[PDB]
Amino acid sequence: NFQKVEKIGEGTYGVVYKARNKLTGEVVALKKIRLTAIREISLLKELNHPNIVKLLDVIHTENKLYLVFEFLHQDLKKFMDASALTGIPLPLIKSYLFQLLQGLAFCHSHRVLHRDLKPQNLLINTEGAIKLADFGLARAFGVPVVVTLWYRAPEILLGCKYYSTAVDIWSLGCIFAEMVTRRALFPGDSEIDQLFRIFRTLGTPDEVVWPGVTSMPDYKPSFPKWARQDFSKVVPPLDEDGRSLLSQMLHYDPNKRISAKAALAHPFFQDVTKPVPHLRL
Ligand SMILES: O=C(O)c1cc(OC(F)(F)F)ccc1NCCc1c[nH]c2ccccc12
């Protein structure tokens, strides 16, 4: 049905190809996934937002699951690498953050979580748009399907079984910091190394800042107690509006962590514009 054009990427869920519909000529991103889900997934075809990748078609044939997505040429990881020596201009960082919060507020309003946000899942086009892609919906929908931990919320790493929309805010805060500084904020290589990198920067959490943290499934009283280091070291250049918003995105307590909807009203976005990136395809 399709002419494979190139392999776009991997991820231990499946493989993604750029492909051309043999009959219509549409170029699409084709996701092959080896194996109540089929129904609720398919609902997403008609649930759409400018800052979410469009799921064109869902095809369950054989012992595999094919997902046909709209194709975009670039992602934020590639753009950030290409911008490492210059840095992404603040107005574009701001526009991207704003759009991603719009995308999250939409899918959170429909009670859909992403769960696995990372730069390489954020697609961008020549028109200044950025879109949520590669949702981690396998577990949530119950599909019978090396992992990056750098953007995982602390409640996930501490074994919370029933985590909330707040996990996506945490991940987006880590990406925000990375656009600003051009370095991953918390590049852990194990679940405990990820946790300890977070603690070394934001302080070991306790019941004062995060009620109930000490009762969490993987919390150990033996965790080292790091002081919180001053937040001025975290994303240095960024102005106080940006730092303020980031600090609310990185609150330990998911109940205190800012929502996508409230973050859209933060003063950091008072002068928000939509610049156009300069993309080499
Ligand atoms: O992005 C993927 O890879 C993916 C995998 C899925 O199930 C799995 F089993 F994992 F394959 C299911 C959906 C997926 N994307 C959904 C994108 C989407 C369109 N409209 C939406 C409205 C609100 C929230 C999200 C969306």
Swiss-Prot record:
Subcellular location field: Cytoplasm, Cytoskeleton, Microtubule organizing center, Centrosome; Nucleus, Cajal body; Cytoplasm; Endosome
Sequence positions bearing Phosphothreonine: 12
PROSITE patterns linked: PROTEIN_KINASE_ATP, PROTEIN_KINASE_DOM, PROTEIN_KINASE_ST
SMART domains documented for this protein: S_TKc (SM00220)
Chain ranges of the Protein kinase domain: 2-269
Binding site for ATP: 8-16, 31, 70-72, 75, 118-121, 134
Site (CDK7 binding): residue numbering on this chain: 7, 77-78, 149
Keyword Nucleus included in the entry's annotation: yes
Cofactor note: Binds 2 Mg(2+) ions.
Induction remark: Induced transiently by TGFB1 at an early phase of TGFB1-mediated apoptosis.
Effect on the protein upon substituting residue 12 to A: 2-fold increase in activity
Reactions this protein catalyses: L-seryl-[protein] + ATP = O-phospho-L-seryl-[protein] + ADP + H(+); L-threonyl-[protein] + ATP = O-phospho-L-threonyl-[protein] + ADP + H(+)
Documented EC number(s): 2.7.11.22
Description of post-translational modifications: Phosphorylated on Thr-12 and Tyr-13 during S and G2 phases before being dephosphorylated by CDC25A.
Cofactor: Mg(2+)
An annotated Gene Ontology molecular function: protein serine/threonine kinase activity
PTM-bearing positions, type Phosphotyrosine: 13, 17
A GO CC term assigned to this protein in UniProt: chromosome, telomeric region
Subunit text: Found in a complex with CABLES1, CCNA1 and CCNE1. Interacts with CABLES1. Interacts with UHRF2. Part of a complex consisting of UHRF2, CDK2 and CCNE1. Interacts with the Speedy/Ringo proteins SPDYA and SPDYC. Interaction with SPDYA promotes kinase activation via a conformation change that alleviates obstruction of the substrate-binding cleft by the T-loop. Found in a complex with both SPDYA and CDKN1B/KIP1. Binds to RB1 and CDK7.
Function according to Swiss-Prot or TrEMBL: Serine/threonine-protein kinase involved in the control of the cell cycle; essential for meiosis, but dispensable for mitosis. Phosphorylates CABLES1, CTNNB1, CDK2AP2, ERCC6, NBN, USP37, p53/TP53, NPM1, CDK7, RB1, BRCA2, MYC, NPAT, EZH2. Triggers duplication of centrosomes and DNA.
Entry's family note: Belongs to the protein kinase superfamily. CMGC Ser/Thr protein kinase family. CDC2/CDKX subfamily.
Name this polypeptide is given: Cyclin-dependent kinase 2
Taxon lineage: Eukaryota, Metazoa, Chordata, Craniata, Vertebrata
